[PDB]
Design a protein around this ligand. Structure first.
Ligand SMILES: [Zn+2]
Length: 224
């Protein structure tokens, strides 16, 4: 990857997939200092030759497409989650995949219409969605109680990958976007650092989030 395993970085310690060697954006030590160490302190982040990998397109926080950007309909749901959140539940759409911001935005619009008009929800059920386009889309957000898993709605953030992943896996960009979303939520204090990661099937009776995606999330950090 773009950072080393020994904790070094910079133009003197090249990474396997990166020269100069970089730092894990989602790690506590995400700044490459003068002395070629990945560190966390202000000195590591604010020197003239220092690089803070928390920031940028590859930072901890992924670009979240807001409700107004993906074309959400008017909602007025204000049932708030107790923050920070103990656990993260992973979902799959069990539906269409999407590869562009337009098609994924349309897909989110469809899912919202299904939840509100077909099932009678106050809004789209999930807190966030993720498309194969590598983007994150805003559902009920960080602060509002979701409707994605009955046993755990009040204690969790629901992230739903858009697609069916029983025999497929999402694009690497989708996975990266979800992980970065989680990391971001942790950095903000929306999600506890000692959070627990669940698949939907772990907390309910479904095949969600599909076999292969469920297999992949075991390798993610903090899976229960
Ligand atoms: Zn689910």
């Amino acid at each position: 990857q773009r950072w080393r395993s020994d904790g070094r970085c910079g133009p003197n310690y090249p990474a396997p997939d990166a020269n100069p060697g970089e730092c894990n954006p989602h790690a506590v030590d995400h700044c490459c200092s003068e002395w070629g160490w990945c560190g966390r302190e202000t000195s590591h982040c604010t020197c003239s030759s220092c690089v803070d990998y928390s920031a940028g397109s590859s930072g901890t926080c992924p670009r979240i497409v807001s409700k107004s950007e993906w074309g959400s309909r008017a909602t007025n749901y204000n049932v708030f989650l107790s923050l920070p959140v103990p656990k993260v539940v992973i979902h799959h759409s069990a539906g269409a995949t999407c590869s562009t911001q337009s098609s994924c935005s349309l897909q989110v619009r469809n899912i919202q219409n299904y939840h509100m008009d077909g099932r009678g929800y106050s809004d789209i059920g999930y807190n966030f969605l993720v498309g194969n386009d590598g983007n994150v889309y805003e559902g009920r957000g960080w602060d509002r109680r979701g409707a994605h898993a009955l046993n755990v709605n009040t204690e969790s953030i629901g992230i739903c990958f858009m697609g069916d992943f029983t025999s497929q896996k999402p694009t690497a960009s989708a996975i990266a976007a979800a992980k970065s979303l989680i990391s971001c939520g942790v950095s903000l204090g929306k999600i506890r650092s000692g959070y627990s990661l669940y698949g939907h099937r772990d907390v309910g009776s479904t095949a969600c989030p599909g076999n292969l995606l469920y297999d992949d999330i075991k390798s993610w950090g903090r899976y229960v």
